[PDB]
Amino acid sequence: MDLTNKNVIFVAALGGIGLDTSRELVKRNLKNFVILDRVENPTALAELKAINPKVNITFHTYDVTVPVAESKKLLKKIFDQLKTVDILINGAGILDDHQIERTIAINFTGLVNVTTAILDFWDKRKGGPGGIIANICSVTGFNAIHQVPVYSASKAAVVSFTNSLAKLAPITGVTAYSINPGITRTPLVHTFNSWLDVEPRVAELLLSHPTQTSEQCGQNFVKAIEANKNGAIWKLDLGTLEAIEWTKHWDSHI
Amino acid sequence: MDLTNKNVIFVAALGGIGLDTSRELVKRNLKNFVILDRVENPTALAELKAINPKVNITFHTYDVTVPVAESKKLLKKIFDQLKTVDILINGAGILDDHQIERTIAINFTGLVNVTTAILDFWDKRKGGPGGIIANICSVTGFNAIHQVPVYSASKAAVVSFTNSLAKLAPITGVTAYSINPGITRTPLVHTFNSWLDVEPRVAELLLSHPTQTSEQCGQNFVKAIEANKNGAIWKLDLGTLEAIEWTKHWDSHI
Numbered sequence: 001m002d003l004t005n006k007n008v009i010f011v012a013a014l015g016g017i018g019l020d021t022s023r024e025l026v027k028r029n030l031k032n033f034v035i036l037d038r039v040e041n042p043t044a045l046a047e048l049k050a051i052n053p054k055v056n057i058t059f060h061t062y063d064v065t066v067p068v069a070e071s072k073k074l075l076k077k078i079f080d081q082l083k084t085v086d087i088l089i090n091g092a093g094i095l096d097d098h099q100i101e102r103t104i105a106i107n108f109t110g111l112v113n114v115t116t117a118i119l120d121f122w123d124k125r126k127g128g129p130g131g132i133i134a135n136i137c138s139v140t141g142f143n144a145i146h147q148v149p150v151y152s153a154s155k156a157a158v159v160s161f162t163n164s165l166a167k168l169a170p171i172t173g174v175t176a177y178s179i180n181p182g183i184t185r186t187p188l189v190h191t192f193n194s195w196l197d198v199e200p201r202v203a204e205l206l207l208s209h210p211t212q213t214s215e216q217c218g219q220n221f222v223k224a225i226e227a228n229k230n231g232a233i234w235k236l237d238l239g240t241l242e243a244i245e246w247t248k249h250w251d252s253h254i
Numbered sequence: 255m256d257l258t259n260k261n262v263i264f265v266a267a268l269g270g271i272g273l274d275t276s277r278e279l280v281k282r283n284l285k286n287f288v289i290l291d292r293v294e295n296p297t298a299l300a301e302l303k304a305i306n307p308k309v310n311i312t313f314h315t316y317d318v319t320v321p322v323a324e325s326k327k328l329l330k331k332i333f334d335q336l337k338t339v340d341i342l343i344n345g346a347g348i349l350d351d352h353q354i355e356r357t358i359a360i361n362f363t364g365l366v367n368v369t370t371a372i373l374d375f376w377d378k379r380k381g382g383p384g385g386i387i388a389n390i391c392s393v394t395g396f397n398a399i400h401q402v403p404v405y406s407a408s409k410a411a412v413v414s415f416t417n418s419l420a421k422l423a424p425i426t427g428v429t430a431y432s433i434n435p436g437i438t439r440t441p442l443v444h445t446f447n448s449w450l451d452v453e454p455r456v457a458e459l460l461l462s463h464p465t466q467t468s469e470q471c472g473q474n475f476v477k478a479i480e481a482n483k484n485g486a487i488w489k490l491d492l493g494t495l496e497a498i499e500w501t502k503h504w505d506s507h508i
């Protein structure tokens with residue numbers, strides 16, 4: 001994948017991992033870089049624009065928990081302007097096992113819904129050109145932080161969902177891969193809530209082990225995007241980039 | 255584990271797999287069998303009651319998609335009468351990838367929320383005796399049926415969540431294991447919707463391959479319950495019972 005001249009939508013581009021990934025993305029000569037995130041960040045937006053004046057950077061206020069109809073409407077506006085979108089990159093995520101419904105709504109349901117919405121424009125069965133989806137999942141989707149069982153379960157859901165998207169590519173025209181960071185120093189893991197307060201010191205304990213910086217994660221993230229491998233399960237841990245092999249425990253035969 | 259004289263709550267006891275499991279359970283001489291299900295089935299109720307008049311069987315009309323406070327209210331009703339409950343079986347589930355939110359709400363959020371609610375009565379930190387949770391997940395939670403990616407992801411979530419529950423047992427006193435049937439002939443799989451209609455013949459095709467009966471499933475379900483292995487991931491496929499080993503791709507080190 002050559003990012004020169006591509007159009008990219010990045011949901012949650014201005015978070016910890018998001019901003020460092022965006023800093024790296026705009027170093028490529030993208031045609032359009034469209035940011036979809038909850039809250040504006042003027043400072044971050046100005047910096048990205050400064051990194052590469054050749055890229056047209058736009059921002060839209062966006063919340064993944066809205067109905068699928070509301071997402072399509074935003075996407076229509078974007079596709080109407082750009083005519084083509086090359087990549088959708090999802091990053092939306094919260095870590096707070098006190099908020100059960102909201103964790104599931106954001107990390108799992110919202111991702112499925114944005115995907116379902118963009119399929120309206122990309123599905124080759126509806127006359128679409130196909131597309132690429134990069135989903136930020138998490139190593140916790142392979143093996144949980146059992147102290148945040150709901151967060152970890154929402155991530156196991158999206159690793160699975162992404163794996164299925166990739167297997168559906170020959171039908172839909174939409175390829176997909178997961179981006180699964182290991183522990184990364186951002187405001188996500190600085191202070192957080194465990195389920196039923198099973199471990200009030202969870203953040204302190206987690207961060208008392210090796211971590212990577214969001215800078216290292218961002219670098220490997222854009223590397224994974226350029227590799228552009230349908231069905232890849234990328235592990236971005238301790239500053240390395242590594243594809244993992246999913247174990248075959250069962251098969252539907254279809 | 256000896257089921258004799260035990261008090262059991264079975265969410266969704268009267269469906270395909272549920273009824274044949276419920277038959278095998280009542281033959282094991284339970285003291286009380288508490289059924290929580292979305293709709294009444296007087297025929298099934300009458301029959302179960304007759305299989306062992308010794309066993310005290312009650313029924314509550316219950317929908318897993320209510321808030322945790324509502325669930326806690328019903329459980330207080332039940333605990334106040336029974337004093338003790340030994341085992342909770344969470345068996346509620348739908349298969350319909352035209353219903354994204356509801357699939358997720360029922361198969362994932364609902365299971366987490368009943369678990370969360372009962373923990374208020376069982377958590378050893380709260381003066382409770384601990385307990386046992388048996389979660390009906392699915393082989394699709396290991397490897398998807400990719401034509402029902404939402405269903406399969408919702409199952410990957412509960413496999414993970416159950417794995418984490420088990421690891422939290424030294425803290426909460428509540429042990430847990432997953433029951434993962436392979437394809438089993440019930441009203442669930444008679445016919446059903448694929449996501450975005452990617453495969454309109456998904457049921458026809460799936461059912462042209464080997465299956466098991468709900469009777470085979472139910473017999474192996476009680477066998478695993480009697481085995482009482484914390485953190486077990488039981489595969490109940492093609493009339494067999496099998497413990498599978500989860501791959502270690504990553505470690506939180508905590």
Ligand SMILES: NC(=O)c1ccc[n+]([C@@H]2O[C@H](COP(=O)([O-])OP(=O)(O)OC[C@H]3O[C@@H](n4cnc5c(N)ncnc54)[C@H](O)[C@@H]3O)[C@@H](O)[C@H]2O)c1
Nearest residue numbers: 012014015016017063064091092093138181183184186188
């Ligand atoms: N930090 C880590 O160690 C780590 C590890 C593995 C995976 N992840 C995942 O990477 C992603 C980014 O996390 P981060 O560490 O940069 O945390 P962060 O809190 O700094 O950023 C989270 C991002 O998600 C966005 N977001 C949250 N709720 C949203 C909503 N309702 N609608 C739209 N956007 C929303 C935020 O606005 C922000 O852009 C998340 O999916 C997270 O689960 C993080």
Ligand SMILES: NC(=O)c1ccc[n+]([C@@H]2O[C@H](COP(=O)([O-])OP(=O)(O)OC[C@H]3O[C@@H](n4cnc5c(N)ncnc54)[C@H](O)[C@@H]3O)[C@@H](O)[C@H]2O)c1
Nearest residue numbers: 266269270271292317318345346347392435437438440442
């Ligand atoms: N049949 C299979 O091949 C298969 C394979 C793996 C896992 N499973 C799982 O086994 C469980 C039972 O499925 P089944 O095959 O007996 O199908 P089924 O449709 O016969 O039974 C579904 C059960 O779930 C209950 N339920 C559904 N929605 C509910 C709600 N909102 N609140 C409370 N209860 C609700 C139903 O009343 C019923 O008791 C489900 O979790 C299903 O996902 C089935």
